[PDB]
Amino acid sequence: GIALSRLAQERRAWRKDHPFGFVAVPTKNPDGTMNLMNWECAIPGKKGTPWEGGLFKLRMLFKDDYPSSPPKCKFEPPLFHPNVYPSGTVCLSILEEDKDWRPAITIKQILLGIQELLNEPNIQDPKQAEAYTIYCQNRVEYEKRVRAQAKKFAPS
Amino acid sequence: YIKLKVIGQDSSEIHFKVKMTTHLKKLKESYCQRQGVPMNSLRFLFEGQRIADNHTPKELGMEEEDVIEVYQEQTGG
């Protein structure tokens, strides 16, 4: 009950003030009504990084314990990134309730923290075998793949 | 130069050929890379002894086809 009120407060605040290039909109139910528990988001690549030009969409899923509990962030489709599970799920210290999650953390702070995570991976806790291998071996191949998937998700 | 069988709890058996004086940290790096597991999330044991990074095969008395055991303390991350 408090989650839907907190999520509705966030939706209004995002509409008024939100970082440039980002998207964060609640999905709809099979009957057309609004579903504040499922948001379709998009994180834009930073200029000067192999991510520039690409708009990477992800989904935020909120449980009934929000904001006491963090949301689950899954890239759709899954991203080539050392800290993204092969399922698309993103792990970050602010996204673990037993770590750095606090109920005050807004949706804006999560999408910006994931955005920073793109160009600055946490190599100590990899969640994907393929991207953690290429990053720690042939960095040039890692950049080429990111730029290839950045052009793959470029706003056409 | 001696060959070392590196065993894990997951029944993984990867063999490495190393010099008798090279620091065993390089073998941790080759296990991290060949298995895609972060090096700081693994514990390497020879006999009942945690293998240090400056430890060498010559210092630990290792011989041909000896076994090193690998544990992963991070059951989830």
Author numbering:
A (entry chain A): 3 to 158
B (entry chain B): 21 to 97
What does the report in the manuscript say about this coordinate set?
Protein SUMOylation is a ubiquitylation-like post-translational modification (PTM) that is synthesized through an enzymatic cascade involving an E1 (SAE1:SAE2), an E2 (UBC9), and various E3 enzymes. In the final step of this process, the small ubiquitin-like modifier (SUMO) is transferred from the UBC9∼SUMO thioester onto a lysine residue of a protein substrate. As the UBC9∼SUMO thioester is chemically unstable, a stable mimetic is desirable for structural studies of UBC9∼SUMO alone and in complex with a substrate and/or an E3 ligase. Here, we reproduce and further investigate this approach using the human SUMOylation system and characterize the resulting mimetic of human UBC9∼SUMO1.
The structure of the UBC9–SUMO1 molecule (i.e., auto-SUMOylated UBC9 K14R A129K) was solved at a 2.85-Å resolution in the P212121 spacegroup. The covalent link between lysine introduced in position 129 of UBC9 and G97 of SUMO1 is visible, too, but the C-terminal residues of SUMO1 exhibit high B-factors due to their flexibility. The Nζ atom of K129 is only 4 Å from the Sγ atom of C93, explaining why K129—which could move even closer when adopting a different rotamer—efficiently accepts SUMO1 from C93. Comparing our structure to those of free WT human UBC9 that were previously solved in two different space groups shows that C93 is shifted by about 1 Å compared to its position in free WT UBC9. This means that, in our conjugate, SUMO1 is linked 3 Å away from its attachment site in a real UBC9∼SUMO1 thioester conjugate, suggesting that our conjugate should serve as a suitable structural mimetic. C52 of SUMO1 and C138 of UBC9 (both from the same UBC9-SUMO1 molecule) are relatively close to each other in space, with a distance of ∼6 Å between their sulfur atoms. There is also unassigned electron density between the two cysteines, which we hypothesize could correspond to a DTT molecule that crosslinked these two cysteine residues in a portion of molecules in the crystal. Our mimetic does not adopt the closed conformation observed for activated E2∼modifier molecules, instead featuring an open conformation. This is consistent with the idea that, in the absence of an E3 ligase, the thioester (or, in this case, its mimetic) samples various conformations. When scrutinizing crystal contacts, we observed that UBC9–SUMO1 molecules form a chain: UBC9–SUMO1:UBC9–SUMO1:UBC9–SUMO1… (where “–“ denotes a covalent and “:” a noncovalent interaction). In this chain, SUMO1 from one covalent conjugate is noncovalently bound to UBC9 from a neighboring mimetic molecule through the well-characterized backside interaction.
